[PDB]
């Protein structure tokens, strides 16, 4: 998958497991259409989101839903989800995210 | 204003000046309606976004548009904007954001 | 003070109050000598650390002690303190730090 | 190695390659003695730092030297190195760091 997402938990010092991630792609009419989605594995990583054939040039939004994640862990968080927008046009993108109930950090690692 | 936004630049080590910030509020029909917007001042701060009368309970989205900010500074960034969602229901909220072309961090400071 | 330190708590979404901050300056013999220290106020800010006369060119280390901070709040943290080194030679420096038991972020805002 | 270090570059959106990392362990006399060191590989990762036999309980400091890293890339950074202190006593520790010339973030991921 040319797009991968990795999520860590800053409160517990662990991979964030079973985090829902949704990806959208901007359509010709300026709407966000669902493109791909998944849940992080035990390693905090989300593999197999998309493929090189499907991941064409475009404007993409990656949404990470934190509310459900924190609640299963017994936390009611302030930040409920985080979103980031970028253009695809190097050809492997990793979005690495760090989660806390009142803070998020996201970084793009873009490689060959 | 019960909602304030402060933005810093991690590349240049400065307040991020003239950053466009848009705030949306989720409507009864689950749509994001425009609620408030502004640009950061020389201090990187955005004051007067809203008021206690207007800032009622609800689900809010704060969007920070980085593309225009980086371009005026001669940078074409990878992350184009960042969004965070939270519920309003302490009664002063500060969203502090740190900007880089490949990274964003946002933190909520919620006080009385 | 040409050097200011501001600390936020990412777990609780608040200023980090009463955080001990120590500043060292590298001596001619390559040793870190105590230069200035203080505790953050209710706003999470540490004012009056030093003065323009005292804050001469040099290599400085800012150390932020998190162990005592987290314990008073009932937390036994993994990261016990964080340190950053920079050279002083713009003329107001703010070190802004964000604290979690398993994570720290520090940013320099350097202005006139 | 029960201790691993991974470093990313927030300016360029890449693994930070050839970053010098030094690890110290606090001695009986309260001095920081050199324990282990290495340089990050092309993946931004530093493997083989230590072993389970050598990595006994103690207070450890991980120092990441950014000055040399940024200069080879044509940057003269403000933050010259970052240090974090923790106690070892889960049994695999990953220190993940994100680098910018005016900002650093470090997170501990502690697993089995």
Q: How far apart are CA B112 and CA B106, in angstroms?
A: 20
Q: A95 has which bridge partners?
A: A5, A108
Phi–psi pair at C72, nearest 5 degrees: -60, -30
Q: Which residues of C touch D79 (CB under 8 A)?
A: 84-86, 106, 108
Q: How far apart are CA D36 and CA D48, in angstroms?
A: 10
Cross-chain Cβ contact D13/A105 below 8 Å: no
Residue C74, classed as helix, strand or coil, is: coil
Q: Closest by alpha carbon to A98, among D38, B10, C98?
A: C98
Q: Are C73 and C66 in contact (CB under 8 A)?
A: no
Q: Closest by alpha carbon to C104, among C21, C23, C15, C7?
A: C7
Q: How far apart are CA A3 and CA A57, in angstroms?
A: 12
Cross-chain Cβ contact C106/D81 below 8 Å: no
**Overall residue count recorded for chain C in this entry:** 112
D26's tokens: 């606090």
In angstroms, this model's resolution equals 1.9
Rounded to the nearest angstrom, the minimum Cα separation between A49 and chain B is: 19
Residues whose CB is less than 8 angstroms from the CB of residue C86 and which lie 6 or more positions away in sequence, other chains included: C59, C60, C62, C93, C108, D78, D79, D80
Cross-chain Cβ contact D102/B78 below 8 Å: no
Q: Are D20 and D69 in contact (CB under 8 A)?
A: yes
Q: What is the DSSP string of C26-64?
A: E-TTS-EEEEEEEE--TTSEE--S--TTT--SEEEEEEE
- Say if residue D107 is exposed, middle or buried (CB neighbours under 10 Å; 0-12, 13-18, 19+): buried
Q: Are B21 and B62 in contact (CB under 8 A)?
A: yes
Rounded to the nearest angstrom, the minimum Cα separation between D3 and chain C is: 14
Other C-beta atoms closer than 10 Å to the C-beta of D57 total 9
Cross-chain Cβ contact B105/C109 below 8 Å: no
Q: What is the DSSP string of B2-40?
A: -EEEEEEETTTTEE-TT-EEEEEEE-TTS-EEEEEEEE-
Other C-beta atoms closer than 10 Å to the C-beta of D111 total 14
Distances from the Cα of D42 to the Cα of A10, A45, A112, D7, angstroms: 25, 20, 12, 10
Q: Are D91 and D98 in contact (CB under 8 A)?
A: no
Q: How far apart are CA C65 and CA C63, in angstroms?
A: 6
Q: Which site among C3, C109, C112 would you substitute to test the B interface, given the most B Cβ atoms closer than 10 Å to its Cβ?
A: C109
Q: How far apart are CA A6 and CA A82, in angstroms?
A: 14
Q: How far apart are CA A40 and CA B52, in angstroms?
A: 39
Number of domains in chain A: 1
Radius of gyration over every alpha carbon of chain A, rounded to an integer in angstroms? 14
Distances from the Cα of D39 to the Cα of A64, B24, C49, D6, D85, angstroms: 32, 45, 36, 10, 19
Residue B73, classed as helix, strand or coil, is: coil
| DSSP tag of C72 | H
Residue D72, classed as helix, strand or coil, is: helix
Place of tokens 């606090």: D26
C103 touches chain A (CB under 8 A): yes
Q: How far apart are CA D112 and CA D104, in angstroms?
A: 26
Q: What element of type H or E holds C71?
A: helix C67-72
Place of tokens 């013999």: C29
| DSSP tag of B100 | E
C30's tokens: 């390559």
- With helix as H, strand as E and coil as C, how does A49-104 read? CCCCCCCCCEEEEEEEECHHHHHHCCCCCCEEEEEEEEEECCCEEEEEEEEECCEE
Q: B62 has which bridge partners?
A: B23, B84
Other C-beta atoms closer than 10 Å to the C-beta of A110 total 17
- Say if residue D76 is exposed, middle or buried (CB neighbours under 10 Å; 0-12, 13-18, 19+): exposed
Q: How far apart are CA D64 and CA C68, in angstroms?
A: 24
Q: How far apart are CA B50 and CA B47, in angstroms?
A: 8
Range of the domain at B66: 1-112
Q: Closest by alpha carbon to A62, among A6, A23, A14?
A: A23
Residue B69, classed as helix, strand or coil, is: helix
**Overall residue count recorded for chain D in this entry:** 112
Q: How far apart are CA B47 and CA C42, in angstroms?
A: 21
Q: Are A2 and A112 in contact (CB under 8 A)?
A: no
Q: Which residues of A touch D109 (CB under 8 A)?
A: 8, 13-15, 44
End-to-end CA distance of chain D: 12
Strand B79-88 vs strand C58-65: parallel, antiparallel, or unpaired? unpaired
Q: What is the DSSP string of A1-63?
A: --EEEEEEETTTTEE-TT-EEEEEEE-TTS-EEEEEEEE--TTSEE--S--TTT--SEEEEEE
D103 touches chain A (CB under 8 A): no
């Amino acid at each position: 998958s040319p797009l991968m997402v990795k999520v860590l938990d800053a409160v517990r010092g662990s991979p964030a497991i079973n985090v829902a991630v949704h990806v959208f792609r901007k359509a010709a009419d300026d709407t966000w259409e669902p493109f791909a989605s998944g849940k992080t594995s035990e390693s905090g990583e989300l593999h197999g989101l998309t493929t090189e054939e499907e991941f064409v040039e475009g404007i993409y939004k990656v949404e990470i839903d934190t509310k459900s994640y924190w609640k299963a862990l017994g936390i009611s968080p302030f930040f409920e989800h985080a979103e980031v927008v970028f253009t695809a046009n190097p050809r492997r993108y990793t979005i690495a995210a760090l989660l806390s109930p009142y803070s998020y950090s996201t970084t793009a690692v873009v490689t060959n």
